Design a protein around this ligand. Structure first.
Ligand SMILES: Cc1cc(OCc2nnc(SC3CCCC3)n2-c2cccnc2)ccc1-c1ccc(S(C)(=O)=O)cc1
Ligand SMILES: Cc1cc(OCc2nnc(SC3CCCC3)n2-c2cccnc2)ccc1-c1ccc(S(C)(=O)=O)cc1
Ligand SMILES: Nc1ncnc2c1ncn2[C@@H]1O[C@H](COP(=O)(O)OP(=O)(O)O)[C@@H](O)[C@H]1O
Lengths: 575, 125, 192
């Protein structure tokens, strides 16, 4: 049957559910001699196709509890006045086979009322379901798990104490989980040796477990269409050996990925960033300060408690393409905490639409995925949108920033969410953002140094084949004030020049065989196998400094606008 | 090349050691004007002069205490602008001309350009 | 432009529609097939966020058509219309020192309109002549103007006009050199 092996994604909420349900189910007799209330209901919510029903079935099988599935529309499709009988009989049957697990798939259909509550019979169904759910006499060990797309879609009374008192957001699987899902979905098709499922997994961003299964099936169907159809040898049952002779090639998977259309790309991603400190070449003072502020409270919470100091839970990066987003990702990676990034377009959308309640939802999501690093990238976007030199007649306060401040003030309770803010215009940022209890720790990210520039060039060119002849230290030193974005542009232009030269050359060489068919075929391989000095020289010919020295001067002004006075530098105690 | 020539012209009078690679200094100065290069050279000369005056003086001050005490050796503590003086000078290197006013000069040069479309002009054959 | 351009609104360049386009583009690239192309006659007022990496960063400048380009544009506009071989097209293209594609299209359309009016008026008169003086033997001489001639094009060019002034071309040249690749690396050589 289905078990933990079938449950893919390694998303680490299956472990939480296990810790939740073993003792109530794995050790049911224990609770008989101990006075404790187990989890009467667990609400699994997330994007559709994430395997919530699969997870519930696997838990039921691995714990031995009698699994009962109450399909939402199955009862809803039944005639009014007798569907209530179906729900009551389902609970009674689950009660009989104690311990039992009752799974309500698509719970947002039985009790969708969000206090709007249209209709008459559906109100009866929701109220009776409430009576049954609250009617659990704590006898036996029936655990009611329900599936829902979002927590707010179901009736709020279902979310109350004793009905569904604890919720788990399965969420979209990540690259590691996408790879494991691909492995589980590719185990009987005799996958080819060339295909590794790693490149596909990385390119598979935005898919869900159902999406991964559909992509694998589409690749298999492409393989079946490409071969074994030309022969057209078919019978009632295709020969096992004949079908096994085919191997799903990388090309088939690539085409399937091109024909994927993932079912929820837009959904926000809660993922541990893969970026590491290696990608950033320097910022040692900044790196150490970030390590302090974030890592120290958790690695050594006892020492923070000993001195009675509460660590700051907000940091605001200010600077000119210098790597603030990358720095935030790296700091999140070092602590192995989930990273949530709120770019400027999202804030601008909330501001234009006059919908700031999304800030509440974003903060709740960050709270659920703890430990997390809630990063508000380019937080000054709203101020720029309203102006910056003259702007609106009013002050710096705006709806979105006010909601963010309210959530931060109401935050800190969680002890895990850490707010990081990045802004290229510190002058226009609202001052309230920098007050204590908010993003008070201001960190300045300067233009990368020569060593930092070398590291940035190496990180950008790690994947590309770069000839050892081209000296990278010389190029980094040559770039007196290039930003990280400028270095990335130079590397991309060099790669583009190399690609164009290689394409043009092999194209001509192919004319050369077509025009003059050679008697003996002897390919000399690639005329340009790796990026050379001339490519980099031509690319650097177009190198440009995006960041002018005047805006760096303004940042230096603000930095010295956070000046530690000029009279205490020699402070000595009287002794 | 112009920067190298300017540096050579400024330092012709001053005694500069052959070890200092002036071409490297010229190429490292990305967009320094002639005034900036002259300022760097003057600062290097000033650093050399200050070091020579302080070292010769402090040596003489110690030596004068004992009459005829140390040998009569005629030492020149700094007889030429050294590399360290050039690093000392470059620490204070400054870009006088901002890229925005160079933008303005190129803008006026474009406005003075001979319009467009008459490049291909050719008399009929 | 709708919000202004010289003074505009009190706020910045950000607007609802461009913000949504940016959000879709940021959430795009997954498809690997859709390619976004943007055309703008006022690059100065375009939102800078549009040009950031991952967005429409590759800026391409389309200049006024050259003499050869003008000849090609005239040929394309006049491909369908019956044009007499007598009217030299290269001379007309070269004559138009700075005409835009729209200006050349207008010239061709005006020439066609003049030819159509002349043909209609002529055959109408010729029909009066038969009605007024019924000829004993019917012998139509066909069309008095079967194709566009030199005189039609000369009259049309008489009204030729340059829609695009040289000052707006100067502003475009400014922006183009506002994407200037520096002025110190042109001689970059690796140490060898
Ligand atoms: C002991 C303590 C821990 C704490 O929390 C620690 C923590 N855990 N997970 C996280 S989050 C995760 C880590 C990486 C990404 C984010 N954190 C945390 C807390 C603050 C800042 N960054 C992280 C708070 C406050 C206290 C205390 C201090 C003084 C006193 S008294 C009365 O003066 O003696 C009483 C209580
Ligand atoms: C190989 C590849 C193809 C691609 O897509 C190609 C494509 N197909 N249809 C289209 S669209 C259609 C064409 C005409 C109208 C539009 N495209 C496409 C892509 C980009 C721009 N224009 C077209 C993307 C990205 C990659 C890659 C590059 C580097 C690496 S690594 C880890 O550094 O080794 C991994 C993956
Ligand atoms: N991590 C996974 N491992 C194996 N199958 C998965 C996984 N995630 C999703 N699936 C596929 O998703 C299909 C249906 O999705 P489901 O489990 O019912 O979630 P939901 O009810 O939210 O749509 C299942 O048949 C299963 O094959």
């Amino acid at each position: 049957e289905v078990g933990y092996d079938d449950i893919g994604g390694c998303r680490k909420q299956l472990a939480q559910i296990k810790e939740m349900v073993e003792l109530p189910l794995r050790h049911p007799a224990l609770f008989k001699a101990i006075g404790v209330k187990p989890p009467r209901g667990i609400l699994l919510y997330g994007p559709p196709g994430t395997g919530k029903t699969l997870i519930a079935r696997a838990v039921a099988n691995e714990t031995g509890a009698f699994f009962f599935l109450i399909n939402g529309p199955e009862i809803m499709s039944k005639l009014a006045g007798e569907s209530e009988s179906n729900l009551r009989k389902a609970f009674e049957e689950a009660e009989k086979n104690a311990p039992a697990i009752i799974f309500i798939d698509e719970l947002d259909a039985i009790a969708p009322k969000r206090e709007k509550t249209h209709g008459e019979v559906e109100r009866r169904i929701v109220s009776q379901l409430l009576t049954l759910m609250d009617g659990l006499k704590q006898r036996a060990h029936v655990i009611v798990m329900a599936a829902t797309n979002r927590p707010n879609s179901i009736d709020p009374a279902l979310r109350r104490f004793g009905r569904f008192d604890r919720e788990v957001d399965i969420g979209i699987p990540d690259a590691t989980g996408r790879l494991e899902i691909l492995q589980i979905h590719t185990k009987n098709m005799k996958l080819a040796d060339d295909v590794d499922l790693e490149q596909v997994a990385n390119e598979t961003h935005g898919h869900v477990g159902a999406d991964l299964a559909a992509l694998c099936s589409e690749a298999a169907l492409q393989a079946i269409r490409k071969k074994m159809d030309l022969i057209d040898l078919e019978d009632e049952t295709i020969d096992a050996e004949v079908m096994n002779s085919l191997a799903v090639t990388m090309d088939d998977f690539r085409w399937a990925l091109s024909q994927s259309n993932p079912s929820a790309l837009r959904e926000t991603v809660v993922e541990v960033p893969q970026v590491t400190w290696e990608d950033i070449g320097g910022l040692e003072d900044v790196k150490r300060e970030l390590q302090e502020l974030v890592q120290y409270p958790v690695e050594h919470p006892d020492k923070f408690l000993k001195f009675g100091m509460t660590p700051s839970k907000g940091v605001l990066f200010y600077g000119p393409g210098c790597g603030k987003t990358l720095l935030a990702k790296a700091i999140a990676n070092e602590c192995q905490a989930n990273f949530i990034s709120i770019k400027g377009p999202e804030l601008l959308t909330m501001w234009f639409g006059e919908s700031e309640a999304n800030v509440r939802e974003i903060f709740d999501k960050a709270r659920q995925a703890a430990p997390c690093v809630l990063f508000f990238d380019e937080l000054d976007s709203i101020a720029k949108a309203r102006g910056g030199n003259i702007g609106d007649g009013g002050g710096a306060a705006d709806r979105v920033i006010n909601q963010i401040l309210t959530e931060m003030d109401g935050m800190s309770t969680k002890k895990n969410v850490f707010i990081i803010g990045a802004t290229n215009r510190p002058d226009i940022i609202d001052p309230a953002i920098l007050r204590p209890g908010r993003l008070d720790q201001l960190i300045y990210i300067p233009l990368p140094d020569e060593k930092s520039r070398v590291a940035i060039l190496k990180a950008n060119l790690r994947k590309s084949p770069v000839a050892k002849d081209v000296d990278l230290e010389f190029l980094a030193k040559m770039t007196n004030g290039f930003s990280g974005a400028d270095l990335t542009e130079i590397c991309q232009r060099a790669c583009k020049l190399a690609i164009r030269e290689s394409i043009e050359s092999e194209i001509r060489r192919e004319r050369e065989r077509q025009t003059n068919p050679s008697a003996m075929e002897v390919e000399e391989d690639d005329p340009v196998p790796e990026i050379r000095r001339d490519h980099f020289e031509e690319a650097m010919r177009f190198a440009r400094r995006s960041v002018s020295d005047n805006d760096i001067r303004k940042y230096e002004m603000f930095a010295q606008t956070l000046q530690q006075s000029r009279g205490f530098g020699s402070f000595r105690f009287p002794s | 090349k112009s920067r190298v020539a300017i540096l050579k012209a400024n330092l012709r009078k001053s005694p500069v050691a052959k070890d200092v690679d002036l071409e490297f200094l010229a190429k490292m100065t990305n967009g320094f004007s002639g005034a900036d290069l002259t300022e760097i050279c003057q600062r290097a000369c000033k650093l050399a002069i200050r070091e020579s005056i302080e070292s010769e003086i402090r040596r003489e001050r110690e030596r004068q205490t004992n009459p005829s005490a140390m040998e009569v050796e005629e030492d020149d503590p700094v007889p030429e602008i050294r590399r360290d003086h050039f690093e000392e000078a470059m620490r204070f290197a400054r870009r006088s001309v901002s890229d925005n006013d160079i933008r303005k000069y190129e803008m006026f040069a474009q406005t003075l350009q001979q319009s467009r479309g008459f490049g291909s002009f050719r008399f009929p054959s | 432009k709708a919000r202004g351009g010289n003074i505009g609104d009190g706020g910045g360049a950000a607007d609802r529609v461009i913000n949504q386009i940016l959000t879709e583009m940021d959430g795009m690239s997954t498809k690997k097939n859709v390619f976004i192309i943007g055309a703008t006659n006022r690059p100065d007022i375009i939102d800078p966020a549009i040009l950031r990496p991952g967005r429409l960063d590759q800026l391409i400048y389309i200049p006024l058509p050259d003499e050869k380009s003008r000849v090609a544009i005239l040929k394309a506009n006049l491909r369908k219309s019956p044009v007499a071989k007598d009217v030299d097209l290269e001379f007309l293209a070269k004559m138009t020192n700075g005409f835009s594609g729209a200006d050349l299209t207008e010239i061709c359309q005006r020439a066609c309109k003049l030819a159509i009016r002349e043909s209609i008026e002529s055959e109408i008169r010729r029909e009066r002549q038969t009605q007024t003086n019924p000829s004993a033997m019917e012998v139509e001489e066909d069309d008095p103007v079967p194709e566009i001639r030199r005189d039609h094009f000369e009259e049309a060019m008489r009204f030729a006009r340059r829609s695009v002034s040289d000052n707006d071309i100067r502003k475009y040249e400014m922006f183009a050199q506002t994407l200037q690749q520096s002025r110190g690396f042109g001689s970059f050589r690796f140490p060898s």
